[PDB]
Structure formats: C-alpha cells, structure tokens
C-alpha cells in the first residue's frame, strides 16, 4: 500500500505490558533510550537534576558487566584505540601527502572542530605543518549555528570530503556519529572503503553496530548499518575501524549533544594525544598510555561535579531569568568561549528557544569594548551573566567587563579554572561571592601548550554548561518525564524520534501514530496517497516550519479526534505542557 515502503522499518507498537516481551525495547538504539535514572527528571529539583545528570555522565566510565555490550574500558575498545593511534602514527611520520579529517553533523561536527584546532596547535607548537582538519554538515558556519537539517545527505558529505582530500596520498577519516546515524558520515565512510589505497575510515559513535541506523537514505543506496557492518569486516585486515563503546542512554532521551559529545572528546583526545606523545618517544601507543589519559578524564568528572551545589544554584538563576523573560549571556575566553557559544546555540533546536535565550560570547566573537558598547546596554535587573575563564587568561580584561556588568545587572555567577595555588586577584572579588572554582592538580606535561589541561578544562566546562542549560529548561516544565516531546522536526532522525514518542505516550498502533503525525504536519491538506508515499524529507521540510506539531498529533490520538479539534483544544488550554499533561491523565 502507499507508505508501506517508507514506514517498513517502523516496529509496531506493543500492547500495554509487552514493551519488553515484544522485542521492542531491545531494538531501541542505546542512544535513543529512556535513561531509567531520569524517569522523573521533570519532577527533580535543581539539586536532584545536577545529581541525576552527574550520574548519567559517570556512565561513560562504567565498566562492562559479566552477556552485555562493550564499553570504553573494555579490552576490545582500548585495543582498537591503540590500533588507530598506530595508524595515526604512520601519517605523522609522513606529513607530505597526509591528512587527518574529523567529520560529523551537529554536535559531532562541533566536537570535530575543537579537536582539529587543538591538534593543529600541538603540531604548530612543534613547528610541524598542521595535518588535521574538520568537516561539518552544512559547511563551516554550522560550527556555531543551529542547522539540524543539513545532516541528511550522503552526497553532501562525500562532496565535502572530496574538497578537502584534494591531491593527498594518505587520508584518515574519523566519521563521528553518536547514533551511528548521520547520512553525512555514512557516505564519507563508504567512499573511503571504495578507495582504501588512499583512505582509512574510522567510525566513532556509541551504539553497537547491530543498532546502527537502518532506514533508507534518500540520496544513497546503503544504510548506515551496512556501511558499519562492512567497516567492521575490514577491521580484521586493519583497513577500517569502528570505535563504538556503549556509554548508556542520555539523561534527556536522544540528546546526544550531552554524553555523546563528551564521550567523543574523551575518546578521541585520549587516542590522538597518545599518538603524538608516543611518536616522538619512539614507542608504540599502548593501553597503558591511553589509560593514564582516560583516568585523568575520569578524575575530571569527579572534580567537576564536586562543585554540584554551586552548579545547581547557577541553574536556578538561569531558570529564573528565562521564567521571567530575560536572557542569559555566556561570556568566556579562548576555547571556553566557543564551548559557551556551542552550548547556547544547541538550546534553539534542543528546547525550541530563541537565540537570545542562552547566548555565548568569545573574547559571536566580540572585543572588550565592542561587548561593552554593543551588548552591555541591552542588559537588565532580571538577566543572568556567566563568566568563564582561567586564571591564565588576562584577568584585567575580565575584571573590567564584570565591573561594567555589575552596574546594569547583579545575577553574575562565574566559572574559574586554576592549577592549584593560583590565587584570584582582588580579594574583594566578591564581585563573585560564591564562585565556581575548579582547581586542578599539577600534572606532568611535556608538550608545549599543556593540552591535557586544555582538554580537562573544556570537558568540565562542557559538562557544567550542558547540565545548566538543560536543567534550567527542565525546571520550566518543557520536558515530559525525560523526553522532549515538543521538538521541531528538522531532519529524518527527529521525524523518527517524533514517531516513537507518539507510540510511547499514546500506546496506539503504528498506522494511527503515523497517520496522526502526517495529518499534523500537512494540515490543512488531508492525507493523499502522494503524501503517504512521500520521502521523509518532504514531511521534514513541511514540519520544520511549524509549531507544536507533535503535541497536536498526540492530542488528536489521545482524544481520538481530528486535527481541527485538537488545535482548538490546544488553544483552549493555558499551556502546551498543561494541555498535554492533563490530556495524558
């Protein structure tokens, strides 16, 4: 029938009580799963939220139990990390005609950017030509923009790869897709297997290959799963690699910007840094060198979340500023500035928030005075302003801007990284009464710009900002249990996540859920056979432009009513959340 092909991969909705027994839950990719720890995230208070998300983040370092999926510390994974460092080494010995690409969509693309900068610095600091570069779905401007739609083309990913692999003789392509999902990466990886003489594909994500994405890609013949299954066979001959530990579900279901983006840096910084740090020693990469670095990243989480109460407080101030109708400014220096901007942008698609709601700033890339003349005047009693810096930064540029921001605002908490024994100038820096001081041990670093210190600090800032941006929105009641129900469908994965949320919350059949979603997307047009049979990209392109698609679809189903009736009910209610929750009662 019309649509049977498009929706063939959709598993039927199970009867109540058989969600486990039907085999449905076992087929939900780890990355999309409901994290049991956060079943009541929507009820947790600020302090609980910090705790629940700290716990979730800790899962990245949890070891493999006794049958079960491999994890970061499992020997299969560390062995693979070693073999990849090794391949990275061959290139590093032979920089002429060598390149190393880090590629991903969305937050994977953002992580790829940071890491390619860092390792480019490191080879500069040694006076070697930079061998690294990034590739992000939608070109360079996707780094600091919400552009969720650009990950859905495999030809675009291959094109970008073609641009950059120029007339190189030896290219390593690290395809990063947390969900082993993005069509952007799948075609990069497949292209690589078709020219092994030059390309070496390495795929990074956090699903087992048997849960890799398997619905058709509109511009490509193979699925991500097939691609990944074939790379896995190539790994026996060391011609492709898959690096895919389970780190457990996200605390907000499917929000791979969080653990996924964290585990991406942890995993790839660890392995790249081992590789460099051991080439110049005339030693192979070994599990032992990786381990040192992993354990440092694991200390970094303990260090970070020991500041929990102050993280919770900052969340309560971010949440208030937004509950009223203020704005939140995230102001930071060098790469923490960027991480800040990345965080604020992700809030647009993640929570349906305006670009002003949580915005990042680097010293998007504004000057001391420029920020002072331009942005400073727009501030107000109710806003929250966050400063994010090292004691190594230029604290005279820092102290100025806080001086000036104190005038027009008082909610100004801050996030300061220091190596132990450094002191915070102005002991009357009770400009910041209750700072977030993260103090780091002394570690032995033989490289120039202390990269392990950079990586620690970036990760810890990432975690604080992610937990804050995310907690602030849950407190406002925008999250339903641990699901973001009212997302904007802006790519095929989101379209599938929407369909899944409909099955999970209504309990009704696949055909009904699908019908209600398409009716909601295409209203006021009725369901035709063309619409039913359309590529998912047509549904996406229409939904992207609307509001409350998913909640309307769900109300239609719960009330067993039309779209006209569900839209009128939604308008009768005080809020979307209240409409939905009271309909769920």
Ligand X SMILES: O=P(O)(O)OC[C@@H](O)[C@@H](O)[C@H](O)[C@@H](O)CO
Ligand Y SMILES: C[C@H]1COCCN1C[C@H]1CN(S(=O)(=O)c2cccs2)CCN1c1ccc([C@@](C)(O)C(F)(F)F)cc1
Q: Which residues are annotated as a binding site for beta-D-fructose 1-phosphate?
A: 107-108, 151, 177-179, 346, 493
Closest CA to 225 of 234, 213, 233, 240: 213
- The reply to whether 181 sits near ligand Y by the rule CB under 6 A is yes
- CA gap 427, 379 in Å, rounded: 26
Token readout for 415 is 């996030």
Q: Which residue has the tokens 């390149």?
A: 99
Q: Answer with the entry of ligand X, ligand Y, none that 32 interacts with (C-beta below 5 to 8 A by kind).
A: ligand Y
Q: Work out how close the CB of 22 gets to ligand X at its nearest, in angstroms, rounded to a whole number.
A: 25
- The reply to whether 488 sits near ligand Y by the rule CB under 6 A is no
Binding residue (CB under 6 A) for ligand Y from 493, 519, 522, 539: 493
- # residues near ligand Y by CB under 6 A: 22
Strand blocks (E) in 252-393: 328-332, 358-362, 384-390
Binding residue (CB under 6 A) for ligand X from 35, 350, 409, 413: 350
Binding residue (CB under 6 A) for ligand Y from 35, 80, 108, 253: 253
- CA gap 498, 554 in Å, rounded: 10
Q: Is the separation of the CB atoms in 27 and 11 below 8 Å?
A: yes
Q: Answer with the entry of ligand Y, ligand X, none that 331 interacts with (C-beta below 5 to 8 A by kind).
A: none
**Phi, then psi, of 314 in degrees rounded to 5:** -55, -40
Q: Answer with the entry of ligand X, ligand Y, none that 256 interacts with (C-beta below 5 to 8 A by kind).
A: ligand X
- CA gap 13, 161 in Å, rounded: 39
Q: Answer with the entry of ligand Y, ligand X, none that 10 interacts with (C-beta below 5 to 8 A by kind).
A: ligand Y
- The reply to whether 181 sits near ligand X by the rule CB under 6 A is yes
- The reply to whether 38 sits near ligand X by the rule CB under 6 A is no
Number of residues that make up the chain: 585
Binding residue (CB under 6 A) for ligand Y from 49, 91, 328, 501: 501
- The reply to whether 413 sits near ligand X by the rule CB under 6 A is no
Q: Answer with the entry of ligand X, ligand Y, none that 329 interacts with (C-beta below 5 to 8 A by kind).
A: none
For residue 295, the surrounding DSSP H or E stretch is helix 287-305
Binding residue (CB under 6 A) for ligand X from 72, 88, 182, 267: 182
- The reply to whether 32 sits near ligand Y by the rule CB under 6 A is yes
Q: Work out how close the CB of 31 gets to ligand Y at its nearest, in angstroms, rounded to a whole number.
A: 6
Other Cβ atoms within 10 Å of 411 Cβ, number: 18
- The reply to whether 215 sits near ligand X by the rule CB under 6 A is no
Binding residue (CB under 6 A) for ligand Y from 42, 148, 152, 215: 215
Q: Which residues are annotated as a binding site for beta-D-fructose 6-phosphate?
A: 107-108, 177-179, 493
Q: Is the separation of the CB atoms in 416 and 435 below 8 Å?
A: yes
Cα Rg of the chain, angstroms: 24
Residues 6+ apart with CB under 8 A from 523: 552, 563, 564, 567
Binding residue (CB under 6 A) for ligand X from 255, 384, 456, 460: 255
- The reply to whether 326 sits near ligand X by the rule CB under 6 A is no
Breaks in the chain (C to N > 2.5 A) come right after: 66, 363
Q: Work out how close the CB of 26 gets to ligand Y at its nearest, in angstroms, rounded to a whole number.
A: 11
Q: Is the separation of the CB atoms in 235 and 181 below 8 Å?
A: no
Binding residue (CB under 6 A) for ligand Y from 22, 34, 313, 418: 34
Q: Is the dihedral of CA 353, 354, 356, 362 positive or negative?
A: positive
Q: Answer with the entry of ligand Y, ligand X, none that 29 interacts with (C-beta below 5 to 8 A by kind).
A: ligand Y
DSSP string, 131-196: -EEEEETT-GGGGGS--GGGGG-HHHHHHHHHHHTTT-SEEEEEEE-TTS--HHHHHHHHHHHT-T
- The reply to whether 253 sits near ligand X by the rule CB under 6 A is no
Binding residue (CB under 6 A) for ligand X from 91, 136, 178, 416: 178
Q: Which residues are annotated as a binding site?
A: 107-108, 151, 177-179, 346, 493
Q: Is the separation of the CB atoms in 57 and 301 below 8 Å?
A: yes
Q: Work out how close the CB of 362 gets to ligand X at its nearest, in angstroms, rounded to a whole number.
A: 21
- # residues near ligand X by CB under 6 A: 18
Binders of ligand X among residues 256 to 285 (CB under 6 A) are 256-257
Q: Answer with the entry of ligand Y, ligand X, none that 33 interacts with (C-beta below 5 to 8 A by kind).
A: ligand Y
380 sits in the region (left: phi over 0; alpha: psi -120 to 50; else beta) called beta
Q: Is the separation of the CB atoms in 543 and 521 below 8 Å?
A: yes
- CA gap 187, 10 in Å, rounded: 23
Q: Between residues 33 and 230, which has the closer beta carbon with respect to ligand Y? A: 33
- CA gap 486, 503 in Å, rounded: 14
Closest CA to 196 of 236, 240, 134, 242: 240
Binding residue (CB under 6 A) for ligand X from 3, 54, 106, 183: 106
Q: Work out how close the CB of 265 gets to ligand X at its nearest, in angstroms, rounded to a whole number.
A: 13
Q: Work out how close the CB of 436 gets to ligand X at its nearest, in angstroms, rounded to a whole number.
A: 24
Site string for ligand X, 137-156 (x = CB under 6 A): -----------x--x-----
- The reply to whether 28 sits near ligand X by the rule CB under 6 A is no
Q: Is the dihedral of CA 483, 484, 485, 489 positive or negative?
A: negative
- The reply to whether 496 sits near ligand Y by the rule CB under 6 A is yes
- CA gap 323, 384 in Å, rounded: 12
The residues of the shown chain that bind ligand X, judged by CB under 6 A, are: 104-108, 148, 151, 177-179, 181-182, 255-257, 346, 349-350
The residues of the shown chain that bind ligand Y, judged by CB under 6 A, are: 9-11, 28-29, 31-34, 179, 181, 213, 215, 253-254, 493, 496-497, 499-501, 504
């Amino acid at each position: 029938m019309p649509g049977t092909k498009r929706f063939q991969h959709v598993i039927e909705t199970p009867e109540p009580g058989k969600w486990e027994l039907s085999g449905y839950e076992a087929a939900v990719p780890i990355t999309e799963k409901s994290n049991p720890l956060t079943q009541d995230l929507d009820k947790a208070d600020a302090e609980n939220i910090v705790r629940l998300l700290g716990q979730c983040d800790a899962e990245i370092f949890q070891e493999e139990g006794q049958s079960t999926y491999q994890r970061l510390y499992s020997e299969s994974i560390l062995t693979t990390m070693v073999q990849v460092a090794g391949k990275v080494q061959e290139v590093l010995k032979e920089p002429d005609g060598g390149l190393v690409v880090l590629s991903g969509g969305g937050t994977s693309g953002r992580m790829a950017f940071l890491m390619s900068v860092s390792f480019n610095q490191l080879m500069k600091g040694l006076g070697q030509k930079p061998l690294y570069t990034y590739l992000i779905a939608g070109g360079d401007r996707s780094v600091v923009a919400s552009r969720e739609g650009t990950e859905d083309s495999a030809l675009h990913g291959i094109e970008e790869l073609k641009k950059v692999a120029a007339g190189k003789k030896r290219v390593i392509v690290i395809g990063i897709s947390v969900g082993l999902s993005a069509p952007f990466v799948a075609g990069q990886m497949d292209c690589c297997m078709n020219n092994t003489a030059v390309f070496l594909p390495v795929l990074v994500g956090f699903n087992p290959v048997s849960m890799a994405r398997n619905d058709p890609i509109e511009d490509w013949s193979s699925t991500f799963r097939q691609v990944a299954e074939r790379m896995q066979k190539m790994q026996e001959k060391q011609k492709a690699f898959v690096l895919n530990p389970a780190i457990g579900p996200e605390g907000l279901s499917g929000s791979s910007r969080m653990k996924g983006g964290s585990a991406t840096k942890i995993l790839l910084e660890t392995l790249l840094l081992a590789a460099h740090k051991t080439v110049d020693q005339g030693i192979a990469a070994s599990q032992r060198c990786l381990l040192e670095i992993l354990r440092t990243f694991e200390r970094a989480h303990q260090v970070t979340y020991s500041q929990s109460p102050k993280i919770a407080t900052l969340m309560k101030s971010v949440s208030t500023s937004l509950e009223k109708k203020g704005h939140v400014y995230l102001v930071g220096w060098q790469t923490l500035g960027i991480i800040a901007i990345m965080d604020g942008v992700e809030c647009i698609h993640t929570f349906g928030a305006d670009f002003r709601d949580v915005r990042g700033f680097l010293i998007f890339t504004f000057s001391q005075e420029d920020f002072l003349t331009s942005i400073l005047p727009s501030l107000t009693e109710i806003d929250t302003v966050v400063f994010i810096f090292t004691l190594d930064d230029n604290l005279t540029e820092v102290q100025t801007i806080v001086e000036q921001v104190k005038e027009k605002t008082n909610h100004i908490q801050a996030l300061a990284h220091s190596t132990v024994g450094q002191t915070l100038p102005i002991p009357l820096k009770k400009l910041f009464p209750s700072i977030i001081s993260i103090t780091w041990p002394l570690l032995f670093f033989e490289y120039e710009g202390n990269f392990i210190q950079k990586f620690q600090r970036e990760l810890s800032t990432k975690w604080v900002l992610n937990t804050v941006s995310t907690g602030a929105h849950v407190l406002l009641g925008k999250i339903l249990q641990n699901h973001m129900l009212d997302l904007r469908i802006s790519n095929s994965k989101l379209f599938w996540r929407a369909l899944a949320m409909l099955q999970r919350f209504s309990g009704q059949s696949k055909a009904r859920c699908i019908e209600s979603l398409l009716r909601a997307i295409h209203f006021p047009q009725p369901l035709s056979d063309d619409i039913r049979a359309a590529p998912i990209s047509c549904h996406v392109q229409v939904a992207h432009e609307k509001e409350q698609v998913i909640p309307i679809a769900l109300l239609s189903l719960l009330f067993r009513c039309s779209i006209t009736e569900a839209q009128a009910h939604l308008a009768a209610a005080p809020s979307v959340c209240e409409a939905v929750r009271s309909a769920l009662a």
